[PDB]
A paper describes a structure:
The intracellular Asp f3 is an abundant protein in A. fumigatus. It contains 168 amino acid residues and BLAST searches reveal considerable sequence homology to the thioredoxin superfamily, the peroxiredoxin (Prx) family, and the PRX5-like subfamily. We experimentally confirm the predicted peroxiredoxin activity of Asp f3 and demonstrate the functional contribution of its cysteine residues for catalytic activity. Finally, we provide evidence for the critical role of Asp f3 in fungal virulence, wherein it protects A. fumigatus against oxidative stress in vitro, and in vivo, in a murine model of invasive pulmonary aspergillosis.
Aspf3 wild type (WT) and its [name]/[name] variant crystallized as a homodimer and showed a typical thioredoxin-like fold. In the WT structure, both C31 and C61 reside in flexible loop regions (large B-factors and lack of well-defined electron density for one of the chains). The serine variant showed little overall structural change (RMSD 1.7 Å), with large deviation of the aforementioned loops (residues 24–35 and 58–64 RMSD > 4.0 Å). Disruption of the intermolecular disulfide bond in [name]/[name] variant extends the α-helix by 6 residues resulting in a significant movement of S61 by ~7–9 Å from the position occupied by C61 in the WT structure, analogous to the movement of C62 in the reduced form of Ahp115. A corresponding movement of S31 by 4–5 Å is likely driven by formation of a hydrogen bond to backbone oxygen of F57. The dimer interface comprises an area of ~710 Å2 and ~730 Å2 for WT and [name]/[name] variant, respectively. The slight increase in the overall dimer interface area for [name]/[name] (~730 Å2) is due to the fact that the loop connecting residues 24–31 is ordered in both protomers, whereas the backbone cannot be traced in one of the protomers in the WT structure. The WT, as well as [name]/[name] variant, exhibited close similarity to oxidized and reduced forms of Ahp1, respectively. S61 in [name]/[name] of Asp f3 becomes more buried, much like C62 in the reduced form of Ahp1. Therefore, we expect that the structure of the [name]/[name] mutant to bear close resemblance with that of the reduced dimeric Asp f3 WT. A three-fold reduction of the WT catalytic efficiency rate (kcat/Km) was determined for C31A/C61A, and a ten-fold reduction for [name]/[name] with t-bOOH or H2O2, respectively.
Residue numbers in the entry:
A (entry chain B): 1 to 170
B (entry chain A): 3 to 169
Write the structure that this text describes.
Amino acid sequence: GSGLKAGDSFPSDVVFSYIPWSEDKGEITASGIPINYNASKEWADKKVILFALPGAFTPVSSARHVPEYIEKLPEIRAKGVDVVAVLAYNDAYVMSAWGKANQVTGDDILFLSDPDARFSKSIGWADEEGRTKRYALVIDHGKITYAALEPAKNHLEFSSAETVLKHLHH
Amino acid sequence: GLKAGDSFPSDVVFSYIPWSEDKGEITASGIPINYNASKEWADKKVILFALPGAFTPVSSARHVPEYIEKLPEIRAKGVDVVAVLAYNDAYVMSAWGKANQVTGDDILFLSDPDARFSKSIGWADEEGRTKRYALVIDHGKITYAALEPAKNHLEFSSAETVLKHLH
Ligand SMILES: [Mg+2]
């Protein structure tokens, strides 16, 4: 891959897969329709936090990583962030279900699939099993302003809500 | 593929998280371990049904709930293991089990890693998902084998149909 650092442009043609939340499909046992989400296009005029993690329903990810972003969402929005998105290698059906498991509604946090971890692979941040690694990006109108890969699979620090917040608070 | 009278293949290993009370919550994750199906099923009567994926429409609305409802009849016919199989990793299969309010081993929610078992019998699709199918395995021997004619077609692998082939 290529790695990403602050000051880099967000790559072009980045496409994720997801199921937009809807009231009719609010039950976790109800499935919606997966569609493409063109992050490069959607995020051109937005300030975005993208955090990736080993997978939906994994231990650290489920116990700390996603709950902390939910808890900090009001402060994150207070700092001008338009989109918060979690990313993993799981398909859109699973990411959708995970959003519901975490009692997220609307688009408060986007639960996005990186199909075959292809985006994460393209920047060198996927692991040997084809999972995305744990990392965070802050992308402000197409420019990377924060980028951190965790030093280990089960280490949550540089991609945490609280840490990303510190960098928005500057 | 497989057919009635075939032996269940050797060295078949799935991945799963055994349900436990302390991890009962969908947001509480256990740790995947290997499930040596060939070894475990040698002296048991087993239903294994595979499907395109956890949290997929037909699988979630009909395929799994119908097995859940028929569990008492299934057990009354001498079946020792009921397992659902999909290409999702064990974390996802585990959560799906909780989403369906299944506990213990009433139905096992099993991962076919990279659909490798399903590929080995030629019953995986071009995206690497398992197809929708069912096997009844009785002490290591296949007594029923069904592959659905399409991804969203539920008939020969349904609980009703498998129940009618439990003689
Ligand atoms: Mg017919």
